[PDB]
Amino acid sequence: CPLMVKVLDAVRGSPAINVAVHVFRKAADDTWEPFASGKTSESGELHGLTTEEEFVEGIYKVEIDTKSYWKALGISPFHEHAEVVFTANDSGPRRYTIAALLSPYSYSTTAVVTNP
Template sequence: VPGADGAARTGPSPALPSLPQADGMSEVGKGTLTTHVLNTATGLPAAGLGIRLAQLQEPGLQWMELAHRHTDADGRCQPFLAQGQAKAGTYKLHFETAEYWQGLGHTSFYPFVEVVFIITDPAQKLHVPLLISPYSYTTYRGS
């Protein structure tokens, strides 16, 4: 199997060093709703990107903001909904991509990305990753 440098590798992979974020990851994993953002133009996590969570409220179908976070050096942030806090309903994650790209000295075709999703089982863990470049984005339901 080729390694990152293209050279063939045989035998077990060397152990990876412990990352400083590893301690915080146990907290991140305890949430009901988590995300992470990867800059696919560089292949690196998108650090410092602002994200807002809102829930669609009835009557009137108004969005109510529940939380605002910024990604850390690993492109992750603390959970948006803690264990037991989620309720069935429609939610959106609003990723502030224009500010992120401006901070890197780039312009972006998308001033923000909104991912709207439905929570049907509040006990189930949800992970909504976002992959971004200045001219594209991709999201999916992660694990």
């Protein structure tokens, strides 16, 4: 798993379950091409987005659909989504975990990057 996403809910003190995530990769024409998508599990984790072969060098955008998440729980949140944009694999293959901690008017995101 070269790319994993983990989402936590700071209101409930729980994993954020069933959060939609869309990943894009910048193409040669500078547009955002759809790359992979999925949703978080009961553990707040999303695995299996991509493979070592497919996850080449590039600029990637991980869009976490926080608004849709909060609305389903009866909260009208501030943000449309949380976007995480980064260059990947520019010094060879790495494993990336993108973590996000969500509140209705705030989020934090961090990356853990390891060398296989």
